[PDB]
Curated annotation (Swiss-Prot):
Subunit structure: Heteropentamer. Part of the GPI-anchor transamidase complex, consisting of PIGK, PIGT, PIGS, PIGU and GAA1.
Protein name: GPI-anchor transamidase component PIGS
Disulfide bonds: none
Location(s) in or outside the cell: Endoplasmic reticulum membrane
Job of this protein: Component of the glycosylphosphatidylinositol-anchor (GPI-anchor) transamidase (GPI-T) complex that catalyzes the formation of the linkage between a proprotein and a GPI-anchor and participates in GPI anchored protein biosynthesis.
Family: Belongs to the PIGS family.
Part of the full-length chain shown: 56 to 200 of 555
Highest taxon of the lineage: Eukaryota
Organism: Homo sapiens
Disease: Glycosylphosphatidylinositol biosynthesis defect 18: An autosomal recessive disorder with onset in utero or early infancy and characterized by severe global developmental delay, seizures, hypotonia, weakness, ataxia, and dysmorphic facial features.
């Protein structure tokens, strides 16, 4: 009856001037996404995404706004321990020069991605859906397993 619960830690990090709402601008909080895969035996699988919304770092803006591959290198790759399976998603403004005109997202040749925020009333639900879409295109969809 093994109750497997696969969780993919994704650090969704928002740049300044990328996701303000009408009354509140930003908050460093956490959301979860569960996508329990149906199985026909006692064992069961739950795919979990732990989105880690937070404000962009002081040096992250410096690294950003240069050109997608350039900034991706400029993040220093942040060498860390047991980073496999984790994702990092940088959220940018609509009129950012990184992705040319209308590409709402971007997937690097690594555990990193860059997505575009759309700056309106919700700004967190549509962004959350884009994050889960890019994450499942980047790690742990239903067809990988």
């Amino acid at each position: 009856a093994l109750q497997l619960r696969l969780m993919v830690p994704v650090t969704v990090v928002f740049t300044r001037e990328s996701v303000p709402l009408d009354d509140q601008a930003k908050l460093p909080f956490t959301v979860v996404h569960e996508r329990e895969i149906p199985l026909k035996y006692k064992m069961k699988i739950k795919c979990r995404f732990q989105k880690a919304y937070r404000r962009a770092l002081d040096h992250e803006e410096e690294a950003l706004s240069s050109g997608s591959v350039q900034e991706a290198e400029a993040m220093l790759d942040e060498p860390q321990e047991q980073a496999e399976g984790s994702l990092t998603v940088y959220v940018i403004s609509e009129h950012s020069s990184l992705l040319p005109q209308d590409m709402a997202s971007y997937i690097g040749p690594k555990r990193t991605a860059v997505v575009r925020g759309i700056m309106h009333r919700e700004a967190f639900n549509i962004i959350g859906r884009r994050i889960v879409q890019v994450a499942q295109a980047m790690s742990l969809t239903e067809d990988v397993l």
